[PDB]
Amino acid sequence: EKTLKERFSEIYPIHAQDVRQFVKEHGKTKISDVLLEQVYGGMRGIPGSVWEGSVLDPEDGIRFRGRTIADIQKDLPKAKGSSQPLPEALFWLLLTGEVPTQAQVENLSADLMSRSELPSHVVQLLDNLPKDLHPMAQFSIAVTALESESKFAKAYAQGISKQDYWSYTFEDSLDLLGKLPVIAAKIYRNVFKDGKMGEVDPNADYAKNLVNLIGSKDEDFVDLMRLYLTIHSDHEGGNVSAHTSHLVGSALSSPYLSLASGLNGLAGPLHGRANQEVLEWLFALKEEVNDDYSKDTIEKYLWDTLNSGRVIPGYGHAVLRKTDPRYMAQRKFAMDHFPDYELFKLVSSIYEVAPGVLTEHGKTKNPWPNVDAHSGVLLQYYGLKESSFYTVLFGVSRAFGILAQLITDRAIGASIERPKSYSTEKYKELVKNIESKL
Amino acid sequence: EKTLKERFSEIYPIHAQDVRQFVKEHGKTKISDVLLEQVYGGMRGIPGSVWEGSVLDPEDGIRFRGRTIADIQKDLPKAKGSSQPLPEALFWLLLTGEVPTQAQVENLSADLMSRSELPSHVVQLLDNLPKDLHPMAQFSIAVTALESESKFAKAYAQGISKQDYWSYTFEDSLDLLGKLPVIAAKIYRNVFKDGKMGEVDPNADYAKNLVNLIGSKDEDFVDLMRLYLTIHSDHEGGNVSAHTSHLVGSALSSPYLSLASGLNGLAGPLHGRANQEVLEWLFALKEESKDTIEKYLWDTLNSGRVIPGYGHAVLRKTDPRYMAQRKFAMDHFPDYELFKLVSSIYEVAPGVLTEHGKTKNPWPNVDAHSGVLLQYYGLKESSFYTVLFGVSRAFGILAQLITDRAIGASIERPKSYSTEKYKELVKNIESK
Ligand SMILES: CC(C)(COP(=O)(O)OP(=O)(O)OC[C@H]1O[C@@H](n2cnc3c(N)ncnc32)[C@H](O)[C@@H]1OP(=O)(O)O)[C@@H](O)C(=O)NCCC(=O)NCCS
Ligand SMILES: O=C([O-])CC(=O)C(=O)O
Ligand SMILES: [Cl-]
Ligand SMILES: [Cl-]
Ligand SMILES: [Cl-]
Ligand SMILES: [K+]
Ligand SMILES: [K+]
Ligand SMILES: [K+]
Numbered sequence: 001e002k003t004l005k006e007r008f009s010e011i012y013p014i015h016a017q018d019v020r021q022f023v024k025e026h027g028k029t030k031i032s033d034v035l036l037e038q039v040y041g042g043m044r045g046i047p048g049s050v051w052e053g054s055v056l057d058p059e060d061g062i063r064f065r066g067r068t069i070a071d072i073q074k075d076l077p078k079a080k081g082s083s084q085p086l087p088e089a090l091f092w093l094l095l096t097g098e099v100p101t102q103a104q105v106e107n108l109s110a111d112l113m114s115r116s117e118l119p120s121h122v123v124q125l126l127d128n129l130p131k132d133l134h135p136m137a138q139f140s141i142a143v144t145a146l147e148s149e150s151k152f153a154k155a156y157a158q159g160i161s162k163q164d165y166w167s168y169t170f171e172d173s174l175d176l177l178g179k180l181p182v183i184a185a186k187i188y189r190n191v192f193k194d195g196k197m198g199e200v201d202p203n204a205d206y207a208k209n210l211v212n213l214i215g216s217k218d219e220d221f222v223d224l225m226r227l228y229l230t231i232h233s234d235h236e237g238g239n240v241s242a243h244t245s246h247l248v249g250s251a252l253s254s255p256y257l258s259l260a261s262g263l264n265g266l267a268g269p270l271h272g273r274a275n276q277e278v279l280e281w282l283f284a285l286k287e288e289v290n291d292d293y294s295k296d297t298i299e300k301y302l303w304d305t306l307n308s309g310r311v312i313p314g315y316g317h318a319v320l321r322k323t324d325p326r327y328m329a330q331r332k333f334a335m336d337h338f339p340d341y342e343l344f345k346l347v348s349s350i351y352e353v354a355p356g357v358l359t360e361h362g363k364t365k366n367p368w369p370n371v372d373a374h375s376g377v378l379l380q381y382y383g384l385k386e387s388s389f390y391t392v393l394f395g396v397s398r399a400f401g402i403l404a405q406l407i408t409d410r411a412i413g414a415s416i417e418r419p420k421s422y423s424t425e426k427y428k429e430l431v432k433n434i435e436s437k438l
Numbered sequence: 439e440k441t442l443k444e445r446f447s448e449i450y451p452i453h454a455q456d457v458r459q460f461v462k463e464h465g466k467t468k469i470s471d472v473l474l475e476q477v478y479g480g481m482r483g484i485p486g487s488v489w490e491g492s493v494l495d496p497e498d499g500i501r502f503r504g505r506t507i508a509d510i511q512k513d514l515p516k517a518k519g520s521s522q523p524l525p526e527a528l529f530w531l532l533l534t535g536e537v538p539t540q541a542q543v544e545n546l547s548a549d550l551m552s553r554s555e556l557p558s559h560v561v562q563l564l565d566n567l568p569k570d571l572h573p574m575a576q577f578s579i580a581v582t583a584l585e586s587e588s589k590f591a592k593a594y595a596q597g598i599s600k601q602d603y604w605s606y607t608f609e610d611s612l613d614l615l616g617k618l619p620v621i622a623a624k625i626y627r628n629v630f631k632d633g634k635m636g637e638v639d640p641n642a643d644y645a646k647n648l649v650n651l652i653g654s655k656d657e658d659f660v661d662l663m664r665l666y667l668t669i670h671s672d673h674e675g676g677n678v679s680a681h682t683s684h685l686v687g688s689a690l691s692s693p694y695l696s697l698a699s700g701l702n703g704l705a706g707p708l709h710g711r712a713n714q715e716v717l718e719w720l721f722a723l724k725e726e727s728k729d730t731i732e733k734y735l736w737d738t739l740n741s742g743r744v745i746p747g748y749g750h751a752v753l754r755k756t757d758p759r760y761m762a763q764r765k766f767a768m769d770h771f772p773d774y775e776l777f778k779l780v781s782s783i784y785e786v787a788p789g790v791l792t793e794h795g796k797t798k799n800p801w802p803n804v805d806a807h808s809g810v811l812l813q814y815y816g817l818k819e820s821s822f823y824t825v826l827f828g829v830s831r832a833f834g835i836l837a838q839l840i841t842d843r844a845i846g847a848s849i850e851r852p853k854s855y856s857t858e859k860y861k862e863l864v865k866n867i868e869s870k
Pocket of ligand 2: 418672673676677678679709751752803804
């Protein structure tokens, strides 16, 4: 059967021609205004990214190439002996728009694992970094240190044509993906454990390799990581980490430098820590309520939180009008594996009463939980209790969506991202002339 | 006299109130349209950034707080015995909008040098990185490794008020700036020399300490570095490195992670790494008259490659940073062979690019002329040239980051769609 690169090589020229024809016929059509408040407000609401792999459906949640969470659960092949799709399978879908066969996924997993050996200088670098250097900083350092392996950078120096960029971008992306579970596990073992790490199983999948190297053989934990890494793999192109990766990549920096920059964006406390924020809030609630999770006790705690001017972390969507299907998938995992786990009972008790309380409070348009309201409790159950590592896991997942778009951008020859800026003094002059009309 | 931090603490509340009133009274005014071709064309022409220190005119080039490069050479204080501007003097102007006195610049240089000592774990990591790992990758690695020292990161975890973010951002920024010449010289000495490092002179300026740590006390080389680090320091808010640093910083990553990300964008061959690409392209042409130059330009274009150092996203005429560098060469070494080659290409390349018919700007940018000046003084290792660009551009990057935290600027987060969804959006727009 065709490999991922072979199938992509057949699909990308069709997409490239489609984009060229679309811009030729409709490029002059106005799709938005830019108001002054938007340039001073982080460009909120401005269409500013072409991102093929995922789009948020306001009724049905995130869609990956048109498929909801329920669709990917039904449609993607599963690991042998499991009901969880693999993140490798979703990566195939993100890049091609097509669902791979089980045999195609197995071959892709084997290709990734064949590329998983860290160069000696990266092992040495990681082993000697201080334990107080944050795991996300260690992560982006290690990814950047792989730039010496970059096939795109070496080929660009040899003078390849623009029409060939995508091929080397693809190879660098798979080389990088193959190493992410090893980098992440090495950081985990060095910072939080004894530094001792096993070896990659050449027949294991990406999530299984990650969990085994982190230090667990529990097949249910493997299944949890397959779920976690699938559902976090992509969420549009406007968010800081996806946008940063696209921007750096648009200057023809390699996938290593592009992903490292995206990871630094994900490391920002306003972007990649929602899981940890929920967990901290759950722990503080548990202490304050003295382990009492009854309806009356929880509702009073939620009313006091909202009445004091604070939000319920993980609840309330700007756009999505129902519970995130990624939340429901994690709830189902907990219901099927550990329904009596005390921390899950707290999460579930909140789910039963929070939407009603938020609705009556009247300050939350879409009073439903997101993926981050449920992820930490599942990680805690399997012993991954070190919350300062959670964004590393997020990056190991989101790298799939980031690299899929980076390959696509090189395949279509997307141009450098370079908007215009002005100072406040010059915006005042611009606005004065617009309002005066001359 | 007032320190930079003291003066900034007086001006930022006034800027904050000014922005708030401006957006309150004029926020609904439309300043641009977004056409489909712009979202599919890198957002070219979209006003998408607020950036105070510098504004780029397509015809006239860069202005720093309203001043051209020539204005900067006249208005800012210089080092003793020198006619070149100091980058730390421009940094003062970028952050405050005001020209520092000579004594204020000297005090700022001394503060930067007082913060220049690298932690042991950073020295050790640099000493152990392979010599074949590109210097820009080593540079962003070293900057990221300083995150363990971040005062902003520690204060944020301790729960400081949003109103106090700027103070820790400011301290991290000056801590980081003070270390950049040491990191850059360490990379140079390790990769190309014996790895041995001299000591920082507490009383020398930023560019002089960089050149001295690289190993040279040539006074004209020091003057070149003063000019180089000044003119590369900022190019408004929409260039890839500045924009990347703003984006990452807007999620409250520290100055270390924001700068490291900006450096990774600067490392792209369509961005700052074009200065290495230019030197390598010049040397390949030399190894291989108007006819021979024109043939080499066409052979490059016909191979599906860009002419490095020509074109620009915004500029539509010759870059004034190119002219400032030509002027330096005319005043110091007009007969230098590599300078004459760059000048000979300037006579031929714009015509070829115009006939080629693709670029919107057939004129050279800063990267066409920077490497040749470094070559004159014996800095022959072109894989180091973008590190120097990064040492400079950190000034403009960090000035805006401090300003952004002082005013509480928003997360940058536009909306994306797939091509399938853009088609639906366009169809509905055109039906109405
Ligand atoms: C700087 C640069 C990236 C700006 O990109 P841009 O805003 O999209 O430029 P344009 O609008 O003029 O691009 C239109 C076309 O002309 C081409 N072009 C632009 N500058 C070119 C150059 N110096 N050589 C060859 N082709 C060039 C572009 O690749 C593009 O081709 P395409 O339609 O097939 O995709 C571009 O000019 C470039 O690649 N320059 C060479 C690298 C360089 O010197 N970078 C330093 C910039 S300070
Ligand atoms: O302005 C740009 O887009 C690129 C450039 O010249 C710079 O950043 O110095
Ligand atoms: Cl996101
Ligand atoms: Cl975001
Ligand atoms: Cl208007
Ligand atoms: K080259
Ligand atoms: K963004
Ligand atoms: K940009």
